[PDB]
């Protein structure tokens, strides 16, 4: 049992949906973590009250290094908040941004710690659903943390999300508003493998439009520099019928990642 006056509150660390969330020590520990603030009203008229719990339940159950970590949870009169594990070294998509693009080694080194957190999360038939570098946090090793587990549901779902942010990564069932399975964050893994590669993700488009008929289409293609070894991988798990996608022990062992990965 929680409560706010339990904290010290330091500064954000990012902006949420619904929301902020912000360093803070648990004074009675001197314990640091970050806690994901969420306003009621806001969450009300949304309608997605339910999915927090869902996010809530999931994300609590979990453990695995490469799995952001959720401490508890508690809620007043207009917040619900979020006691998360912080991971101090930012966001990937902050690295991205830095790097321009990541090498071979560095892409299949986040790609196994995302493969072996997603794996997992599998065996739970748990599918994440909003895999993308802003939910991608680094821990104190640099090593690869899932985070955001808002959109997590268990698989099979029909469930309907909250348009895009970025339609990007969500694959073609799912854009459809068809029913989805494991196959969904494979397909993200994809798009994450390109985009680190390459700067940025295989169907960005100025518009929603563009992207859409991109996704559907599996139209996207390689720059010159992109390894014969990481087009495959990429190929491999682009694939516009979910059952086509291979399983994460196959991308764990892919000869590129086997190569290149650490
Ligand atoms: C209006 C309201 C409440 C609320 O007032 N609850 S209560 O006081 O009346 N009532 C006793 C459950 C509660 C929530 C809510 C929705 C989801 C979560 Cl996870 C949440 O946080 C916790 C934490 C520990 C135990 C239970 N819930 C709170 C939301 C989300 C949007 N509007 C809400
Ligand atoms: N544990 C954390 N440690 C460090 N930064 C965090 C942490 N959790 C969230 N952030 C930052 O805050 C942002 C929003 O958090 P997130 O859980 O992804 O919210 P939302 O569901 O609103 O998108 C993140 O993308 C990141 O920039
Ligand atoms: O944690 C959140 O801010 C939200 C809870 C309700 C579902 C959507 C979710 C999100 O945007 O990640
Ligand atoms: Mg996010
Ligand atoms: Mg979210």
Not at 205 to 221: C, P
Request: glycine content about 6%; proline content about 5%.
């Amino acid at each position: 049992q929680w409560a706010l006056e339990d904290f010290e509150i330091g500064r954000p660390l990012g902006k949420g949906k619904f929301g902020n969330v912000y360093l803070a020590r648990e004074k009675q520990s001197k314990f640091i973590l970050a806690l994901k603030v969420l306003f009621k009203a806001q969450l009300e008229k949304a309608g997605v009250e339910h999915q927090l719990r869902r996010e809530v339940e999931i994300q609590s159950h979990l453990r695995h290094p490469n799995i952001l970590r959720l401490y508890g949870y508690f809620h007043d009169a207009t917040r619900v908040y979020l006691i998360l594990e912080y991971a101090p070294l930012g966001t990937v998509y902050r690295e991205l941004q830095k790097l321009s693009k990541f090498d071979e080694q560095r892409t299949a080194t986040y790609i196994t710690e995302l493969a072996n957190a997603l794996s997992y999360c599998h065996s739970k038939r748990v599918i994440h659903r909003d895999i993308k570098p802003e939910n991608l946090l680094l821990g104190s090793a640099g090593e690869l943390k899932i985070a955001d587990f808002g959109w997590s549901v268990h698989a099979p779902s029909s469930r309907r999300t909250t348009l895009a942010g970025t339609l990007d990564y969500l694959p073609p069932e799912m854009i459809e508003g068809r029913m989805h399975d494991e196959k969904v964050d494979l397909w993200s893994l994809g798009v994450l493998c390109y985009e680190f590669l390459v700067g940025k993700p295989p169907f960005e488009a100025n518009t929603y439009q563009e992207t859409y008929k991109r996704i559907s289409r599996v139209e996207f293609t390689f720059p010159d520099f992109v390894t014969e070894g990481a087009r495959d991988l990429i190929s491999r798990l682009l694939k516009h019928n979910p059952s086509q996608r291979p399983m994460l022990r196959e991308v764990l062992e892919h000869p590129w990642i086997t190569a290149n990965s650490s």
